[PDB]
């Protein structure tokens, strides 16, 4: 008396990839060319930009689908319990990727500006961005459904 | 005697993706380089952008179709009434995408001028955008067509 | 003895979708960057390019095909005459896209160049478009088809 | 003791079609920002593309693959002689855009510069070009083959 | 018992050059590099300024100080009554000098902006101009004075 | 027992003067091309520092330093008590010089900043002023200057 | 005991067009925007540009998958020896686009700079490019293959 | 008791392919127009890369996805051991295009900043670079799986 | 009874040098950067302007003064008739500089605009002038006192 | 047995002046368009160097020779001790404007940078100058000579 | 019976500084900023002014004004023949001023453009001047009157 | 028998500031805005300005020929031997502002280039300078004419 959870998972990978591949290279396709330093010095755009954001939300989003599609294709061709492992894995790589934006990332609320004191830079600048609020509001529900993935699949791991 | 609307459901629903994908990254791909603000102040742009266009009606729109295609895949593989608790949420977020539009833009009727006044920027300035009235015609059939589909799952809901 | 203009229609349907793809985002697909206008006035740009391009023809041509494709699939599944309501809908429809263009372009011809004088902008200016020629000469191949598909689909409707 | 033709036909169909789709946007996708003239008048780039460049040569080779492409399909679904006036209208059709080149271009060789003199210009100019050299080769594939494919179509319709 | 007017055409004849050369080439030493046109039409400002700005008010005045000069040294070495003649040609050059600005200039009060239609430059455009108040208050001087030697030229005239 | 004065005045007369020569064309000679305004608009340069900058403080005193230099060669040469007329006229002069600037300028201390909202510029904009410190340091001197020569004339008028 | 080389020239095949797609619209993409000259004369650029490169390496690879692929569909349908005259073809097709790069490049290897000394050009100039290096190693590749798919055919069309 | 490697060789297979196409003209897309050099020497940007980006890794990947293909599709068909030659060539081709980035690049980590002193340049300079940590990163997951690849490929070709 | 000429001739020379001088080095002073021409071609600007200035006004009249005044001090040390041959001089001289106006320029009436065809200049352009009102004013200035200046010195030299 | 320094006084007075004029308006001429700062930011320009360079060495030096220029000329009419008040107002008005430069500046070595962190400006940001080694030297000097005036004029008011 | 020449020495001597003093700083004073070359090099401009504009006409005949006017001074306090041997120097320098021209400028008459190659600079250039018609006329006039101080200085050196 | 050198001196006196007040602030008058420097960093210019133009040969000399004119004045009112003190110091100043070249140019011959290494600077670079021949031209006559005062101060001051 389980496994509408196989349903449900289903379904929210569909729906990751449909929201993903939506806004994919529709809306970071211009996070380089908007990302304004109130200066003149050169180069201290990459720097900043390399600082605050070393990837995207998007690509790491990418690879949590990978390692998480990884179990289904696995698990496919397994043999032509030793199911629940890949279970488990497909658990803890999610944990990962939720946890590493939690660090990463300042609580995902991305900020409107922020500052920057690197090197080729002379000393704090102000560096804006672009379209902080809109990823904001994807992330909501890329984190939001990690987390019910998380919570189903432990729960249909509670089977003895 | 009714389900006509499954056909004109099929309908609209082919036809709102068909609306979209053709004007879809063809009409806003441009919504961030045609964004003039009649200042020499960096990242003004951006900041009265966000303030004023926090997600266009194109993401919100392309999340309804999501969440009203949900519906008809979750009933799909439903077994292999509990049937109308699936039509009464396609209802309801369907009524949602509607009122969210009706806050966050003014109306639907998109200004060639606004203003804006946030803090980097240094007081009321005047930001143009592009094609408002483009847009704003667009946004006339989505929403008259997200009525229709509301009606009709209205009316058919009507069957004890 | 008739519906040889059933071949036509959808002969002249695969035509105008063939017609339209090629030169589709490939003629207008520039129609922003090249509407140049003598002045150095911010955002007067973006307004008479509203005032003067409220739509594309590549737009309205695509709901066009639309509303016009919608009673070939509307009639395919209509029951799992009530046929020639279908029929007058197509031609009422198409009627309509060409009447709105003899309202809303100045009869086809695009001018080199035009004026204007809204709000923004000073006074009258002149502001220069690209390729208007081409772009004409492509509604006369769309304009003219449509008025094919109406002339058979008036003749095929006059059979009792 | 005939019908080769017919296969080379179709050979030189698929050949027109892949020289065009690889070079298609390809070659000419920057023929509009790389049409220098050597002002400071606005406007005058686009006038002086609008006279010497009314159409590109690819727009009209589309056209020509589709109202030769058209006595194809027209004579598939036929019924259900009658044959020749297909291929005749084959023949006229080619040797018409055949013509309009001959006409419009000055006999293929695109030159280098050219000269203009419409009313917002001040006077002559010298409107540079790109790739004239290029283009002019691939135009010598298209008119070959479209010499090709009358010529066999001429002696293939010389069959009583 | 007159010829305390002797006196006052001396102090204000000291009075107007001093007046002069302090603001002379301190004031409209810009008037050329400071009258903005909103276009970007090349020499509009040339035009434009020759058609409002014929001479400054400072080179009118220039010569009116030579003109009405000239009878001071013109009657001192006029020997080695014949000695009105040259008051009466005072009187009517200065009187000529204040006439011309009552055309030439709109009534003094200069305007913050204007309006040009001529010849190079496409329309109506709207140039501005540099310190019009500042001058403005000059000419008041300027004229005021003006009207003094006037005055006491004609009541010292008026001596049988 | 008095005239003492007499001194204090002609010391102060060229101290004035050479105050004022020396940083005269040195200071506000950059007076105009200095004046940013954080707009990208056209000409609010000018309409600002019109509305902010009727005239300068060095042309004010040069008039200043006439009316009031006019009583020493007016009764220097007025007869080939009738003193002190010349006197007064000196008093009230000065004075109003010194009245309107209380009026005119916000009492001496010129502001880094000022704000502007006059009809071509769109709203409120942001003009800064470059040295507005240095030159309320040079008005200081010439104010209390002023002040001096005015309050020993009103010392040694008061002499029966 | 023969015919290994139909397999290695069907691998060759699907090699040469994946590893043309991959940096087919990758790599020469943007081979107009990166093709300084140290002037500031206008159109020099698209000038040398045109003396220097005619065609991409590109293109020319392109049309000789054609030709070579022509007699692989060309001998597919050629009934319903007549088989090593397409050979003996697609030989001499291959051996003719490898000479031509011999003549119009100086022998594969690209130089980082060149020089151009045609009309519009004042004099001798310095034009630079991109990734000269980087193409030159994709040539290695395909010239490679190519060798080898003649030597193959060489071999094997010596079969009596 | 082997041949769990194949599975996990299709799977690695599949995986780099998806970890590349994602980010493959996604990250790189923008490397040449984000090259940044503190000078204004013409094209020393364009000579600096080419020095010390002869090649991207996304290349020289796609290559070795290419070459450790080869041998799927070889032995695929190899009939209508002879196995194993196969499968070292697998091997050496992987550990090759290994090898070369540890030349080529210094040791995976990118620089922020790099220098050049190359002919057109007239120093030192200092070119930065866009987003090295990113690719750096990317370049973890490619290196270690295909170290894997290599390690499996190794444990199974250790097989009598 | 005569020589009321040489009063005259003291006085317009007095006349001629103070009308130079005070719009001398303030009217051309500006004659070489407003010289637009509408283009972009680099030193059109300095031929054109040396095609049609060779000289200016002012250089000719100053040479004009020199070359008259030489009689003068000529004359003056010429012993410690022998007097009219410098005045027959000052006659010629004048009409000299008088002559080579109505032939180096159109007759004195500036043009607002020229033409110019110089080799550097690709074909005819269009090169705007500053000020031609104005300075042609000047010109009527000192061309009607050297014809009185020349009548009087006729008239005088007609003396026995 | 004294008043050798009266000599040197005057000698030192001349010095003063010579030193002043000739680097007068030829050092700090430039001194507003030679203020760089690395922003982009308006006005933090005339910010920064309104909060470092309230008034220049220039100007200060000017009012220090006024003022101790002025008991030369008052003292010359005093009449038509009361000496050495003179002398001593001279001695304290000279060390005010010693000790008025060890506040303002830094203690004479201008640095050739500075930092600024006023309110238009975002942060801390780098502004250079121009030739701060120069002016110093020129200090050094008339710092020097003031030092001298000082201790002679105590000297020789060490007279009883 | 001679020592006219003394005259006509004086004379031209005054000449020539009048000359020079009116065109002085009138002509060459914007010989920098109007030197063009069809470049983008850095710094090509001041190298190639500096090749062919090692000194302008200018100075060369201010130092040879100096240099004969040395003689006049230098015999004017002579005692408190020795008298020739300072007029047979006043002839050597001023033919070597004459021969140093005929040496460094192509023999007076200035070219329009003008070529150069050296280091900065890539190759040939063409670099322009601004003004080589004018500045030549007055070179006629400084070398005439030269040969004229010349031709009577030798003539009156002839005399025992 | 001496005392010839008096007149010398004099001479070489009135040269010298001849010489320099002519070309004074008329060649180095452009002796900032000409220091090209091929780079982008801001400021950098400046910084090596600084390094190599301490300070410019004019100012220098100025002082030069204030603290050698200091001894003749000193000299005139030294009463109302103790006249070769003051000749002597006239000889060390000399001989110390011709040392300090030799120490601080590199001996004269002023570079067409020089690098620069500081600080705000990245690296080496390569910073231009304006007419080095022509300075160094007149440092080569001021250079050798206070040789001159100093070898006959020398000879003269050999007098017991």
């Given at each position: 008396?389980?496994?509408?959870?196989?349903?449900?998972?289903?379904?929210?990978?569909?729906?990751?990839?449909?929201?993903?591949?939506?806004?994919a290279?529709?809306?970071?396709?211009?996070?380089?060319?908007?990302?304004?330093?109130?200066?003149?010095?050169?180069?201290?755009?990459?720097?900043?930009?390399?600082?605050?954001?070393?990837?995207?939300?998007?690509?790491?989003?990418?690879?949590?689908?990978?390692?998480?599609?990884?179990?289904?294709?696995?698990?496919?061709?397994?043999?032509?319990?030793?199911?629940?492992?890949?279970?488990?894995?497909?658990?803890?790589?999610?944990?990962?990727?939720?946890?590493?934006?939690?660090?990463?990332?300042?609580?995902?609320?991305?900020?409107?500006?922020?500052?920057?004191?690197?090197?080729?830079?002379?000393?704090?600048?102000?560096?804006?961005?672009?379209?902080?609020?809109?990823?904001?509001?994807?992330?909501?529900?890329?984190?939001?459904?990690?987390?019910?993935?998380?919570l189903?699949?432990?729960?249909?791991?509670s089977?003895?």
């Open positions: 008396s389980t496994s509408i959870g196989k349903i449900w998972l289903t379904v929210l990978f569909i729906f990751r990839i449909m929201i993903l591949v939506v806004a290279k529709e809306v970071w396709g211009d996070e380089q060319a908007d990302f304004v330093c109130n200066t003149l010095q050169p180069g201290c755009k990459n720097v900043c930009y390399d600082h605050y954001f070393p990837i995207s939300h998007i690509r790491l989003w990418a690879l949590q689908l990978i390692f998480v599609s990884t179990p289904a294709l696995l698990v496919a061709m397994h043999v032509a319990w030793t199911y629940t492992s890949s279970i488990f894995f497909r658990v803890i790589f999610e944990a990962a990727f939720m946890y590493v934006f939690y660090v990463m990332y300042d609580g995902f609320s991305m900020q409107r500006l922020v500052k920057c004191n690197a090197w080729p830079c002379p000393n704090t600048v102000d560096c804006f961005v672009s379209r902080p609020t809109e990823k904001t509001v994807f992330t909501v529900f890329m984190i939001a459904v990690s987390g019910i993935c998380i189903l699949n432990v729960t249909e791991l089977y003895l």
